[PDB]
Structure 1
Amino acid sequence: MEAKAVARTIRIAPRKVRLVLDLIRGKNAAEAIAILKLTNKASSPVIEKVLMSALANAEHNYDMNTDELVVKEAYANEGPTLKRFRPRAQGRASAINKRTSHITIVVSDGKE
């Protein structure tokens, strides 16, 4: 029916990936690959490889034509954060959160 794919524990933190997806979301799939290829943020190549995979499953596992496909949804969710620190003045050291993003995306046909 309406196929999806996911990239779990992507190293980029979720606020950023969301800045890109929000451009991507809802658009026709072709347009989306363009916009994705032309935006200059890290999440852009990542989300690119993910939307490609999703189109792949959609052609290959569900026999739909790729052209009429549409990005039904795309979103990033909090995934577990690597926890570090940087040493600071007078011997105190303060935390750094290197957080991660699970990026889902789903493409589409009609209701059936």
Structure 2
Amino acid sequence: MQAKAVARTVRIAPRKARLVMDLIRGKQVGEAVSILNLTPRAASPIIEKVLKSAIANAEHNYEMDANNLVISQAFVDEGPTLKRFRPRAMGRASQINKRTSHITIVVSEK
């Protein structure tokens, strides 16, 4: 049995979220929460909320036991990019990609 949660179009760059995901992928949900709580990165509180949302789903919707859950899938996909422009010297503008992420966690019983 699996429970999934997704955060779609979160304003954080995918590369930056994936640094943190790599810490928790395959870990037990107890450990993963700890890691996220003590990892000082912008992505940590966002990924913590998805992870906790997945556990809640596992308990509420599917009567899984939160003590026996493991992160079975964890990935970040590119959301749509907000395109912005930074003015540079000599009247030139240069693009800025304010990238967004779709953050998925799947928990499952061990």
Query: 1:57 and 1:84 mapped to 2: Cα distance?
Result: 37
Query: 2:27 and 2:73 mapped to 1: Cα distance?
Result: 9
SS in 2 for 1:3: strand
Q: Unmatched 5+ residue regions in structure 1?
A: none
| TM-score scaled by length of structure 2 | 0.98
Match of 1:55?
Answer: 55
Query: 1:91 and 1:50 mapped to 2: Cα distance?
Result: 43
Q: Which amino acid counterpart does residue 69 of structure 2 have in structure 1?
A: L
| TM-score scaled by length of structure 1 | 0.96
Match of 2:38?
Answer: 38
Q: Which amino acid counterpart does residue 41 of structure 2 have in structure 1?
A: K
4+ residue runs over 2 A deviation? none
Match of 1:81?
Answer: 81
Q: How many equivalent residue pairs?
A: 110
Cα deviations by residue, 1:75-102 (Å, 9 ceiling, x for unpaired): 1001100000100111001000001100
Query: 2:89 and 2:2 mapped to 1: Cα distance?
Result: 54
Q: Unmatched 5+ residue regions in structure 2?
A: none
Structural RMSD (CA): 0.7
